[PDB]
């Protein structure tokens, strides 16, 4: 039987990978980091409260100008916020109200969203007509589209619930690159700062590092015990952190190809919806199901602070590109800005 | 106050956007959200044409009441990752064929379509997001089941069934077996209706169940409930 021989070879390869990871690990991040000063207590106050959504807010994204926001809720409305003045720049009515992701273009020209309609809809913000119209609708996913991220005005990577990540060409609307290999539904997505690689967290308790220009998985990261719902690169692009339903955040390194540190507490038992990093990467912000965001010392696994003030589950997180503020969205139809 | 002309005009635009958002929310608050569920293509389509590829939107108005019925068919993924989106629906319309008690699902060996429907109903009814959400259970294809129960007994489906091979007793037994999967009888109600291929009063049953759910909601507002 060739199938049993190939299963034995796959088991041998997995054991070789595990042995190479074990032999390459000598001193953990705790053992080197325990000799530096902690960050103390990180206290943040709600500076703005963005009201106007009427259903559970499922996603958000910050602008690269660190002032403009976009948020998605089950109202069927994509509201673009001026976070400095608490002003609604745009309100985009959606064809499908079951939106679970939204992205904002780095140029600021476009907004994507997607959800249970299996379609990433690109919206042209800066039109000659003065309204926000659909640029195009990207179809081809057979499952719910769980995350989308703009590379530029013409390239976008969309995570989806068909156990498949996909890279699209917005000029043609065609499936440029298909990323396959995940067993469970892919729930999160995060682009590298140079947009050369990206990581995806799925429901197979695994994270995979893909290359955009070759379209095939480089490394696979395991260690979680439940469905990964959040993922985010470290700011230099050489590491990333995940968040799953087992109330643990794990930090993984691309070069070491290992898990470095678990950010978990005994008093936290609920799942993690959103994971975001600060500008320096020293603080890891994670949104949980117990209605608040916990700031973690990303180098020491210490609870640096708690961002409490949401009446329902914190579903989405976002730190501005200048690191000035963190914005938490939640199921109680509110967005809050913190400093 | 300490605002420019463009700042004041942007604030005015934001207030207009807030006004349109409030009107849209008030329009959507009077609509009835229904989640349509069932094990495969069993009776969803006949029910849909009786009132009227990702999620399917079905819009119909009955007695000056607008209904939003969502079909999550062909969403072949983990249900728990998107079933919390329908936490605030008015009721769940669960469609079950009565004639597939002896048919096989053909996806798994020795798998019954009826038992797959029981397992899906057990997962949906006792879900954490549907603790207080009522279920309008529809038992599709009663005439086909009535004419085929003479040829094939129900004991091949339920080994512990010892009643007569009649339509009424076995149909009541199937309804009781589906209602026994509700472990939250103190906080939710299951409405069961038997529907034929061409049955006109299906909408009225949905309207009555939705009206009972709306009465339950109305009471809470007065605190009375």
């Amino acid at each position: 039987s060739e199938l049993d021989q190939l299963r034995q070879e796959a088991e041998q390869l997995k054991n070789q990978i595990r042995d190479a990871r074990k032999a390459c690990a000598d001193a953990t991040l705790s053992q080197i980091t325990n000799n530096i000063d902690p960050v103390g207590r990180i206290q943040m106050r709600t500076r703005r409260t963005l009201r106007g959504h009427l259903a559970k807010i499922y996603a958000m994204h910050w602008g690269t100008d660190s002032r403009l926001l976009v948020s998605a809720s089950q109202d069927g409305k994509l509201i673009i916020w001026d976070s400095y003045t608490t002003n609604k720049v745009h309100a985009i009515p959606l064809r499908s109200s079951w939106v679970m992701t939204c992205a904002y273009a780095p140029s600021g020209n476009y907004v994507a969203c997607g959800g249970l309609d299996n379609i990433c809809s690109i919206y042209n913000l800066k039109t000659r007509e003065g309204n926000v119209r659909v640029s195009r609708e990207l179809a081809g996913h057979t499952g719910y589209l769980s995350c989308c991220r703009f590379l530029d005005d013409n390239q976008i990577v969309t995570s989806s619930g068909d156990t498949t990540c996909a890279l699209w060409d917005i000029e043609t609307g065609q499936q440029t690159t298909t990323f396959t290999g995940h067993t469970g539904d892919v729930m999160s997505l995060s682009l590298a700062p140079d947009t050369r690689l990206f990581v995806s967290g799925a429901c197979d308790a695994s994270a995979k590092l893909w290359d955009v220009r070759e379209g095939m998985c480089r490394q696979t990261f395991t260690g979680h015990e439940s469905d990964i719902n959040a993922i985010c690169f470290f700011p230099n692009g050489n590491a990333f952190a995940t968040g799953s339903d087992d109330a643990t955040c794990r930090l993984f390194d691309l070069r070491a190809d290992q898990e470095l540190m678990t950010y978990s507490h005994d008093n936290i038992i609920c799942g993690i919806t959103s994971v975001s990093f600060s500008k320096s990467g020293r603080l890891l912000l994670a949104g949980y199901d117990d209605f608040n965001c916990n700031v973690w010392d990303a180098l020491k696994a210490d609870r640096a602070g708690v961002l409490a003030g949401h009446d329902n589950r914190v579903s989405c997180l976002g730190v501005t590109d200048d690191g000035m503020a963190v914005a938490t969205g939640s199921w109680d139809s509110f967005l809050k800005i913190w400093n | 106050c300490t605002l420019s002309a463009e700042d004041k005009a942007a604030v005015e635009r934001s207030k207009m956007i807030d006004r349109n958002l409030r009107e849209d929310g008030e329009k959507a608050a009077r609509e009835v959200k229904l989640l349509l569920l069932g094990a495969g293509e069993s009776g969803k389509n006949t029910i849909v044409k009786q009132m009227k590829t990702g999620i399917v939107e079905t819009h119909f108005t009955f007695k000056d009441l607008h209904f939003k019925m969502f079909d999550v068919g062909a969403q072949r993924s983990e249900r728990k990752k998107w079933i919390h989106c329908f936490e605030g629906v008015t009721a769940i319309i669960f469609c079950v064929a009565l004639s597939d008690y002896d048919l096989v699902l053909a996806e798994d060996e020795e798998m019954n379509r009826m038992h797959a429907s029981m397992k899906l109903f057990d997962s949906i009814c006792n879900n954490k997001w549907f603790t207080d959400t009522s279920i309008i259970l529809f038992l599709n294809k009663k005439d086909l089941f009535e004419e085929k129960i003479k040829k094939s007994p129900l004991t091949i489906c339920y080994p512990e069934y010892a009643g007569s091979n009649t339509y009424e007793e076995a149909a009541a037994y199937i309804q009781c077996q589906f209602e026994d999967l509700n472990k939250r009888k103190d906080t939710k109600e299951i409405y069961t209706h038997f529907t034929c291929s061409t049955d006109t009063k299906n909408v009225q049953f949905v309207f009555d169940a939705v009206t009972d759910v709306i009465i339950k909601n109305n009471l809470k507002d007065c605190g009375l409930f």
Partner: single-chain antibody
Amino acid sequence: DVQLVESGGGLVQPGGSRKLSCSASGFAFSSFGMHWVRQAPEKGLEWVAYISSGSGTIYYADTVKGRFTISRDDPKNTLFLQMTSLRSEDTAMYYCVRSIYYYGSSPFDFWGQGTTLTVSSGSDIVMTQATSSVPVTPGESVSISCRSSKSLLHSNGNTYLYWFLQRPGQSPQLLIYRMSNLASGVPDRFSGSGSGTAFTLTISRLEAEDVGVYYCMQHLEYPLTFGAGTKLEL
């Protein structure tokens, strides 16, 4: 395409009443605030009236306030300027101007072709241009300077300075909308700069396509005041 067509102009006896219409097509008329800007035969842009989106805010120039009436009907995309008691100084070519206001928006971006109406026979921000007409060689850089009585820099960091170019026999177009921001469809050879009350507009590698009268307008506070107009010749 975005188009604004004006109508209703003509010869009017003094003290008469006429109504101007501005039919809008090719854009979402309801979401745009709308301005009336007239230009007398002496070649000077003058702001007349403004109506916001939703008709919630209406402003008038001090010379037409209580005597002109601006209104819009968003169902049919028409802007109205009901004028009563017309005197000889109202003889001007009235432009219907399109302007939207949000963060990063470009107001005064589209101007209509204008309708010509003929009448027979203190605290404002003064906008000053030192040069009224200068000759320029094509292919060479030119600078148009503008000054303001009040500082146009606001507390929010925006300097509300607008640059308009009006070619001969054409409606004015927007070039720079906040003292540095290049407009849409205008070449990168137009650049604006300045600080406080001193302003400049640089046109490197000038062509015959740039020949016209250049106006500086402030949008810090109403009424909106234009410059005298710097004309480029040769």
